[PDB]
């Protein structure tokens, strides 16, 4: 059952108590797609990083994993904001017609969450349709990572992925988190 969900929530509250101002929450707790029409694309690009736990430092991440291991809790991914190796967003890509930067369609509240979004989004772009997304991603010897509104993703590696119905259901989490507040 959803005991898995309640149990990760207990672990999370425990480690928040253990390392008070060091564990911020899951990425899904800390940002939101700016408009409804982009929620599926944001959901697809973020992927499993929606549930990554954002922390300050590598030591916090290591201590948290050690706690989880001792308690026999399920594995978690920790993104230490101040240790992640990220490059600034390539703003020239805003000039590509038919495409927006995915990170431009996410808002986030503590300014330092920008670093987790740079990690998770990089220079991914969102396009209106599958044909637009494929042309911009594969059209050049310099490929791009693009995602259409239905969640079909084209990666620089040449990987292609999707599943529109599953992604629609996953994106319902965003409005639930907004309610929660």
């Amino acid at each position: 059952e959803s005991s898995r969900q309640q149990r990760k929530a207990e672990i999370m509250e425990s480690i928040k108590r253990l390392y008070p101002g060091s564990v911020y929450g899951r990425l899904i707790d800390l940002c939101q797609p700016t408009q409804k029409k982009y929620q599926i694309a944001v959901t697809k690009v973020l992927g499993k990083n929606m549930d990554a736990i954002i922390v300050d430092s590598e030591k916090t991440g290591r201590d948290c994993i050690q706690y989880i291991k001792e308690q026999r809790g399920e594995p978690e991914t920790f993104l230490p904001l101040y240790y992640l190796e990220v490059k600034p967003t390539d703003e020239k890509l805003r000039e590509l017609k038919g495409a927006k930067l995915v990170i431009d369609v996410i808002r986030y509240e503590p300014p330092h969450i920008k670093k987790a979004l740079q990690y998770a989004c990089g220079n991914a772009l969102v396009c209106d349709n599958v044909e637009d997304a494929r042309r911009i991603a594969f059209g050049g010897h310099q490929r791009h990572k693009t995602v259409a509104l239905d969640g079909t993703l084209f990666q620089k590696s040449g990987v292609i992925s999707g599943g529109a119905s599953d992604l629609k259901a996953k994106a319902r989490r965003w409005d639930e988190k907004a309610v929660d507040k």
Partner: protein
Amino acid sequence: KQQLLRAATGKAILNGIDSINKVLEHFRRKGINQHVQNGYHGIVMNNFECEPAFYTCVEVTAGNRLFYHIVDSDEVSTKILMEFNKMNLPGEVTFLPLNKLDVRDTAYPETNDAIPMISKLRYNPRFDKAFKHVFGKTLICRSMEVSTQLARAFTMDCITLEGDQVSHRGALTGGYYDTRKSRLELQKDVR
């Protein structure tokens, strides 16, 4: 039988596998797109083998990428997906297209402390780019402390035999990992 493997897989994951077979069957009923079936080579986990000392770290490294679909081309990939979504089928599907995969070599540091995961897998050389994509970036390291150093200094993910992960960008993953039979072991029995 082979349903033991299915029970270990998770219905969200099986959904994409069943749906892909729905698309293929549909193409077969209409006598169209035989190149799609001929270019569909199955999932990653069905196309490699490794020694059991590596089951945990290989399986943790792949995660759901064990269920990525090796296919001939981006053509095969997009035709399946366009129909997949047309029919509003459940699941997610990811394709490794052999004609489009673009993989980057990186500098393995030669050390007893860390060895390439890729050279521990046995697979058909025709799928090399698919297996290099999933596994070519990860080293198997002797300890979390070595993992911490090598993943920081180089462009390789590090994982211990027990499954602790350090990404080459700083992402740390770990927790309690069962002694249950690996998905890889259950697949080994049906092969």
